[PDB]
């Protein structure tokens, strides 16, 4: 399950080669990554850092998740937050982008540890 949840976390939140930062990027990416298939996912973060840098976050000290578990970690990374505008429905979803280098919190599971969920 951690291997299927890990690939999904990959499809949904990672893009190291690019640096997005625009609505147009959010509109393209959200669709290339299959998140507007049936409904316009409300909010989504794309991390623009090397995969090994995201795995390296799992090793930081442990902190509480929004759910109460303690298998969560934090790191300051470059991201592009994609916010649905609410205008149109799938498959034509339109997004608003926001760039910043900010603090993200992900959940890691398994052995070796891998990111399986984006807390916030
Ligand atoms: O900064 C944020 C906040 C939330 N989410 C997504 C992740 C979760 O859905 P997901 O597991 O399907 O990615 C959900 C609640 O955090 O919103 C992001 O992508 N970025």
UniProtKB/Swiss-Prot annotation:
Expressed in the cortical and medullary tubules of the kidney, and in the transitional epithelium of the urinary bladder (at protein level). GO terms for biological process: antibacterial humoral response; defense response to Gram-positive bacterium. DUMP binds at residues 8, 13, 41, 44-45, 118. GO terms for molecular function: nucleic acid binding; ribonuclease A activity; RNA nuclease activity. GO terms for cellular component: extracellular region; extracellular space. It is an enzyme of class 3 (hydrolase). The active site is at 13 (proton acceptor), 117 (proton donor). Induction: Induced in response to insulin. The keyword Hydrolase applies. Transmembrane segments: none annotated. Disulfide bonds join 26-82, 40-93, 58-108, 65-72. The modification Pyrrolidone carboxylic acid is found at residue 2. Cleaves preferentially after uridine bases. Has antimicrobial activity against uropathogenic E.coli (UPEC). Probably contributes to urinary tract sterility. Belongs to the pancreatic ribonuclease family. This is Ribonuclease 4. It comes from Homo sapiens (Human). The gene is RNASE4. The chain holds residues 28 to 147 of 147 of the full protein.
């Amino acid at each position: 399950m951690q291997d299927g949840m890990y690939q999904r976390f990959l499809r949904q939140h990672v893009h190291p080669e690019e640096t997005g930062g625009s609505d147009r990027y959010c509109n393209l990416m959200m669709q290339r990554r299959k998140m507007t298939l049936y409904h316009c996912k409300r909010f989504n973060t794309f991390i623009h850092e090397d995969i090994w840098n995201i795995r390296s976050i799992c090793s930081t000290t442990n902190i509480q998740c929004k759910n109460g578990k303690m298998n969560c970690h934090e790191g300051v990374v470059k991201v592009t937050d994609c916010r649905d505008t609410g205008s149109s429905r799938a498959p034509n979803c339109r997004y608003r982008a926001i760039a910043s280098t900010r603090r993200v919190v992900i959940a890691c599971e398994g052995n070796p540890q891998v990111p399986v969920h984006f807390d916030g």
